[PDB]
Design a protein around this ligand. Structure first.
Ligand SMILES: Nc1nc2c(ncn2COCCOP(=O)(O)OP(=O)(O)OP(=O)(O)O)c(=O)[nH]1
Ligand SMILES: [Ca+2]
Ligand SMILES: [Ca+2]
Ligand SMILES: [Ca+2]
Lengths: 1085, 267
DNA sequence: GCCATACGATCCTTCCCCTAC
DNA sequence: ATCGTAGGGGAAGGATCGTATGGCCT
């Protein structure tokens, strides 16, 4: 008949651009060997596999890669009589597009599906899988966006009654728009009605009448909200049609199972004719919102497909050691590795290796793969790069991986492939997703614009999950390279291949290409192992289902959208409407004064559980429940019915729950259930799985606490700083009240014993001195000297319960978290301690920071373990506190501090020997902004960035960490610095950093003085609490330990020796030197 | 203390008198001690500054181990020799040096007394200093025959020091005389002395008759350092016998200081 | 005694990195 | 386009100050 929707993706090709290296044809003499072939070739693209030549666009019978697509270029490649039945299907993604009756007049759609979109319409497309395994795309009609406007304002400014006249005026305004695109729009496209609504802001607002406007398009609503009378307040003008469809029908979810049911008037979903298919699914349906129901029975994922992919490039122009550039035609993608998994059993299904040229994999790799039962790899050889890229795109379109993954694909792989496909070969990739055309296929980066903070990729019906982002926020490592993380979490030491030896391997022969392919397949296998070890899709799907947005928006949008979408449900349910509005803002928490020092007595820790959510729930803080002025709440009993607070010099009133319940209270109540469920499985059975449930519950805690951030965002969407400031003030008041209550109750001599008889057993010699020594927001450290640490856990729990019962109303609960045995307080948010069980906790100091090298960290860890574990040094450190630091500047140190000097001298000896490992002296600094957005421009890592850019190396992105090493200051180094400063326009500035690879290649000596000084500084700043928090005295005492007091002549010894100068000391250890002294003195005296 | 050293007021007066012109330089210097006394070594402007202190200059000097070297500064900007300068502490009573420990771990502890308004006890306890052994050290001291000597007086420095001080471009051409004088014709000043070496301001009253030293200096700098040490005058000792000739200017008086410089080794 | 000055430490701001809440 | 605020600590820069003496007193 004829396809109603044109298939933009390639299906028949005859002409293509031929670009390939010249070292592949027959290995020609050096004359015609360098360079890259270029020109226009007129033939059908083809693929080679095992000596078999096939056409890439030759769907049917024989094939090399697996295919899951039914149609191909208007041809039904399905068996005759294929009419599968669909009753239950799991939907994973939701689409949205625009359709017109004129375009769809060729199809055989029902009247009910044509009258609802006759001028224009929006159709919600749900993509999923049937239990059998058939891809299904169901279309839902009858959904229109709507927004609220003030009836009084439009009646006063425009003076137009008869709401149809409002639609006529809107259509007239659209018709006279400067752009010649709103043609044919009339009043029939708009539907204006009168509704009774109440504004969410403030408690004194009275319900009023609003014009609810339904618009039957997507860009029309945006244009009306943007240009049409911007002086009138608008409500919910930014909510998309997908959210409207989700929230209008109760119980609907964006990720889960759905069931097709008969409609209102016994109407059924219409299967779509195969010729009129708009997607690449096997079967499609047409229905409305009345035909769909939620099935609570099935709760397992269907047989989805995952594609872990990776690409490799090789510079083909001059200076082959330079990094490849996508814009350069000579640079090519030599190889692509693609591993296809099934997301129902976590089992390997297919392995593919696209290679440009012949590639014979080594037999060792094949034997290793066969030993583990993995499938035998399939290698496809291509004559040009365009053929390989077209084959990869065809595989993506045909197999249709529902989930796609890799490592650093958002920043390197996908942009490179897209640039090569679009800027060079001019290929339309709009229809290469799941839609047959006019889809979304794009990548956004951070760049200079501060609007975005994350790099995103949007593909319709394709969930891209880069593992770099997942690894970045699950483990803490100085370097996030593939080898480092592989050795860290997988404990698998894997070989690596840089980009400086790839050209030699490629020009050598097919065996080297096979070696490269082996390395790339190992890379893809490692990425898949990480993906299936962490399983991000389950967590992201759960968050998307709970929030009410797509999984893609859950991954890429942020945290404000989830809270806004989840609050919109309650806003619509309660009759409220959310208005549209689009330096430090307010005061935060309080940190107490730390009594820094080395405490040997037990230290217990008390902390509130879910501080901010509990405060919001208990005190009824919300947008609707707030009055900024008096006489508007002056009809209720004071105190009992409302709470008056003093925030920022202003009095605020929050009425109690029994009068007007908070909207945010139900938000937090719903969001905390997931965390409670997650934390209930950790202590059941988890030898090593609990490390992932901890991350999951931490993420849920972050998204729960994000409600306060959302309500405290300045210049955001739906902001109100009053609630956030009230929460902070309440938290500070609770902290101070807890401190005062603990000080004034159990601290005299016996009150703790009277309250708890169990204190009779645990009583060390000495009087009670129960006091608070440190506080942070809601954490309180209590130094319980004179009591044994074995009886301060149950007692601590009882005390926490008593305090929570006697001071704060529910759901605010304070619990005894930890119990230190030896504490070392340094400053605010910086302390190292030992738990009663035996574990050691480090917070704040450079040991747990990512900008310190391995040598200093190892030495500091050794010193900390020495101090906290050996009895002699601990006793000596305790005795150090008796005298002030000044006395220690002229008195010998206690005999205990002897192993400290041993560690110091060992570190000094190890740092001053030939052939030092450069990897132990590398530091890392994170680039967070664009280089042009730096005021200082002197940071010792922007220098490395510019040096890497100058030599055409791998320029780091705007969110990864640059490593560097501080080289020694030599005359050559100084001359190079001067030349660089002169061209790019005394003691040298500390911007001596250099790329570690460059230092390894050129063999540059490292600045030992800088590293030793930094080691001493870290050691003194960590242990300055032992000497009364004085940096100078501690530094002098630490430097006293070192034996680096060698005093040799500055290359003038030879001249004096030639003048007849006696030698004293040094190698002459015998007695004549004494006579030499006489021999000197008789010359002088 | 196996090597305790006690310096009382009787020798403290002499030490203070010796250090009175030495208001600088020796603050940043090395101190080598053995069984005979203390030698202070410094490298002022590439010039070897040496201060000897014999055992007879201390009341209770004592040593038991081998030679040792100590750096005056302790924890930076705190010199062990700060007691012997001008009138920093106008109540100096006694000086104690406490060497304790093993041969490679010997430590010097300095404690200072004070003549208060009604006492002469320790009192001062926060000014005690501790300095550990320098471990590996090599010290080169000028030794050899003094060759020809001479008793240069205070007024002579107005013409033997402030003559050229301008490197080899304007050198002093260190000589004595082709006929038996001590006239050092530098470039134009032509300072003239009569030598008259025994054993009149023209006569220099020399000793150890050589009267052949005529080798030019390596580079004429001098001046400042001798000005810096505030030396009134002293004896010039020559070391041309060695392959590298040297010149040593040693002051006159108790515990004199010596400035040592290297001449032209061409001969 | 003098007075002059070029050295030097010595704070004191401001900006940028990661951490603890 | 899209969570918030307190804290320490290293590094590069500008202004401040306590002395060390000499030129000059003489
Ligand atoms: N806006 C915002 N606020 C945060 C954030 N983190 C902490 N807070 C403030 O809560 C202080 C207590 O933090 P916890 O880590 O104890 O958390 P908790 O809720 O008290 O839970 P536990 O006490 O059980 O750890 C955050 O990421 N964003
Ligand atoms: Ca790669
Ligand atoms: Ca990679
Ligand atoms: Ca808490």
């Amino acid at each position: 008949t004829g396809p109603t929707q044109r298939h933009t993706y390639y299906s028949e090709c005859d002409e293509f651009r031929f670009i390939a290296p010249r070292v592949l044809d027959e290995d020609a003499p050096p004359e015609k060997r360098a360079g890259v072939h270029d020109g226009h070739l007129k033939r059908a693209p083809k693929v080679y596999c095992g000596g078999d030549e096939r056409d890439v666009l030759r769907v049917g019978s024989g094939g090399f890669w697996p295919r899951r697509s039914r149609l191909w270029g208007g041809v039904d490649h399905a068996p005759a009589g294929f009419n599968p039945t669909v009753t239950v299907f799991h939907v994973y993604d939701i689409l949205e597009n625009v359709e017109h009756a004129y375009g769809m007049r060729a199809a055989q759609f029902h009247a009910r599906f044509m009258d609802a979109i006759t001028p224009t319409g929006t159709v919600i497309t749900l993509l999923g899988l049937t239990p059998e395994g058939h891809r299904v795309a169901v279309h839902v009609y009858g959904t229109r966006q709507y927004f609220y406007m003030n009836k009084e304002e439009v009646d006063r400014h425009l003076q137009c009654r008869a709401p149809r006249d409002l639609c006529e005026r809107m259509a007239a305004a659209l018709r006279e728009s400067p752009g010649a695109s709103f043609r044919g729009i009339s009043a029939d496209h708009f539907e204006a009605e009168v509704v009774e609504r109440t504004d969410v802001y403030y408690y004194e607002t009275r319900p009023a009448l609003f014009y609810r406007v339904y618009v039957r398009s997507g860009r029309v609503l945006s244009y009306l909200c943007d240009n049409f009378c911007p002086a009138i307040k608008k409500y919910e003008g930014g909510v998309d049609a997908t959210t409207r469809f989700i929230l209008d029908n109760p119980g609907f979810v964006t990720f889960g199972w759905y069931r097709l049911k008969p409609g209102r008037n016994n109407t059924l979903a219409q299967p779509r004719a195969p010729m009129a298919f708009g997607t690449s699914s096997d079967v499609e349906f047409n229905c409305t919102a009345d035909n769909l129901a939620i099935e609570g029975g099935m709760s397992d994922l269907p047989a989805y497909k995952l594609m872990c992919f990776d690409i490799e490039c090789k510079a083909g122009g001059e200076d082959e050691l330079a990094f490849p550039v996508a814009g350069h035609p000579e640079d090519l993608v030599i190889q692509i590795s693609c591993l296809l998994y099934d997301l129902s059993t976590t089992a390997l299904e297919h392995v593919l290796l696209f290679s440009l040229g012949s590639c014979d994999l080594p037999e060792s790799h094949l034997n290793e793969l066969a030993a583990r039962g993995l499938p035998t790899p399939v290698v496809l050889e291509f004559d040009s790069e365009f053929e390989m890229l077209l084959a990869f795109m065809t595989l993506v379109k045909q197999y249709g991986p529902e989930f796609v993954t890799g490592y650093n694909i958002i920043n390197f792989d996908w942009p490179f492939l897209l640039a090569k496909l679009t800027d060079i070969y001019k290929v339309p990739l709009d229809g290469y997703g799941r839609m047959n055309g006019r889809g979304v296929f794009r990548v956004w980066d951070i760049g200079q614009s501060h609007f975005q903070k994350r790099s995103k990729i949007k593909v319709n019906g394709m969930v891209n999950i880069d593992m770099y982002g997942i690894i970045t926020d699950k483990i803490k490592l100085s370097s996030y390279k593939l080898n480092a993380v592989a050795e860290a979490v997988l404990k698998d030491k894997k070989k690596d291949l840089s980009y400086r030896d790839i050209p030699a391997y490629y020009a050598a022969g097919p065996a080297q290409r096979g070696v490269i392919g082996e390395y790339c397949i190992q890379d893809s296998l490692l990425v898949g192992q990480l993906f299936f070890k962490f399983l991000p899709h389950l967590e992201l799907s759960a968050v998307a289902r709970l929030a009410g947005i797509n999984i893609t928006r859950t991954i890429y949008d942020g945290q404000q959208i989830r809270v806004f979408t989840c609050l919109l449900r309650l806003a619509d349910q309660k009759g409220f409407i959310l208005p549209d509005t689009q330096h430090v803002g307010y005061q935060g928490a309080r940190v107490l004064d730390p009594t820094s020092g080395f405490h040997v007595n037990p230290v217990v820790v008390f902390d509130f559980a879910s501080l901010y959510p509990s405060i919001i729930q208990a005190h009824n803080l919300c947008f609707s429940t707030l009055s900024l002025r008096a006489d508007a709440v002056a009809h209720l009993e004071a105190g009992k019915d409302y709470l008056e607070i003093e925030v920022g010099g202003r009095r605020l009133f929050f009425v109690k729950a029994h009068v007007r319940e908070s909207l945010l209270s139900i938000l937090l109540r719903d969001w905390l259930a997931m965390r409670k469920q997650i934390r209930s499985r950790i202590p059941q059975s988890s030898p090593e799985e609990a490390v992932l449930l901890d991350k999951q519950q931490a993420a849920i805690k972050v998204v729960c606490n994000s409600v306060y951030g959302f309500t405290g965002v300045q210049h955001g969407l739906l902001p109100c700083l009053h609630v956030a400031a009230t929460v902070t003030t309440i938290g500070r008041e609770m902290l101070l009240a807890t401190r005062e209550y603990v000080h004034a109750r159990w601290a005299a001599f016996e009150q703790l014993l009277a309250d708890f008889p169990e204190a009779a057993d645990m009583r060390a010699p000495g009087p009670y001195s129960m006091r608070i020594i440190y506080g942070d927001t809601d954490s309180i450290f209590v130094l319980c000297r004179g009591l044994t640490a074995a009886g301060l856990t149950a007692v601590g729990d009882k005390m926490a319960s008593h305090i929570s019962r006697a001071l704060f109303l529910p759901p605010i609960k304070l619990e005894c978290e930890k119990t230190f045995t030896k504490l070392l307080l340094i400053a605010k948010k910086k302390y190292i301690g030992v738990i009663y069980g035996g574990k050691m906790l480090i917070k704040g100091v450079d040991l747990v920071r990512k900008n310190n090298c391995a040598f200093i960290n190892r030495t500091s860890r050794a010193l900390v373990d020495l101090l906290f574990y050996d009895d002699t040094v601990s006793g000596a450190a305790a005795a150090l506190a008796e005298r002030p630091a000044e006395e220690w500047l002229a008195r010998p140190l206690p005999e205990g501090l002897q192993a400290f000097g041993a560690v110091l001298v060992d570190a000094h000896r190890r740092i001053t020997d030939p052939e030092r490992d450069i990897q132990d002296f590398v530091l890392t600094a994170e680039l967070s902004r664009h280089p042009r957005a730096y005021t200082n421009k002197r940071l010792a890592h922007l220098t490395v960035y510019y040096k890497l850019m100058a030599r055409r190396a791998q320029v780091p992105s705007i969110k990864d960490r640059i490593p560097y090493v501080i080289v020694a200051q030599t005359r050559e180094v100084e001359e190079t610095v001067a030349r660089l400063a002169a061209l790019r326009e005394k003691l040298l500035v500390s911007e001596l950093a250099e790329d570690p690879a460059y230092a390894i290649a050129h063999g540059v000596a490292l600045n030992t003085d800088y590293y030793f000084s930094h080691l001493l500084g870290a050691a003194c700043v960590t242990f300055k609490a032992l000497f009364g928090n004085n940096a100078k005295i501690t530094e002098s005492l630490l430097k006293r330990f070192i034996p680096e007091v060698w005093h040799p002549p500055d290359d003038v010894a030879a001249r004096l020796r030639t003048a007849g100068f006696g030698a004293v000391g040094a190698g002459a250890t015998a007695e004549e030197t004494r006579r030499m002294l006489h021999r000197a003195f008789d010359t002088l005296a | 203390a196996p090597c305790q050293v006690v310096l009382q007021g009787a020798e403290l007066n002499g030490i203070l008198q010796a250090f009175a012109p030495l208001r600088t330089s020796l603050l940043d210097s090395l101190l080598v001690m053995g069984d005979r006394g203390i030698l202070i070594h410094n490298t002022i402007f590439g010039e070897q500054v040496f201060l000897p202190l014999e055992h007879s200059q201390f009341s209770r000097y004592r040593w038991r181990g081998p030679t040792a070297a100590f750096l005056s500064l302790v924890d930076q900007k705190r010199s062990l020799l700060s007691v012997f300068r001008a009138n920093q502490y106008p109540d100096l009573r006694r000086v104690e040096l406490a060497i304790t420990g093993q041969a490679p771990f010997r430590t010097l502890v300095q404690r200072i007394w004070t003549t208060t308004s009604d006492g002469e006890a320790v009192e001062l306890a926060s000014e005690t200093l501790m300095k550990r052994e320098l471990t590996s050290f090599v010290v080169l001291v000028p030794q050899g025959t003094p060759d020809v000597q001479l008793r240069l007086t205070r007024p002579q420095l107005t013409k033997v020091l402030n003559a050229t001080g301008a490197d080899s471009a304007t050198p002093t051409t260190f000589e004595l005389g082709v006929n038996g004088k001590f006239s050092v014709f530098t470039t134009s000043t032509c300072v003239t002395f009569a030598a008259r070496e025994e054993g009149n301001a023209k006569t220099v009253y020399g000793e150890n008759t050589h009267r052949t030293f005529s080798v030019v200096v390596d580079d004429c700098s001098m001046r400042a350092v001798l000005r810096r040490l505030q030396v009134g005058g002293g004896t010039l000792k020559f070391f041309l016998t060695t392959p590298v000739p040297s010149l040593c200017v040693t002051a006159t008086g108790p515990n004199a200081v010596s400035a040592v410089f290297l001449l032209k080794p061409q001969k």
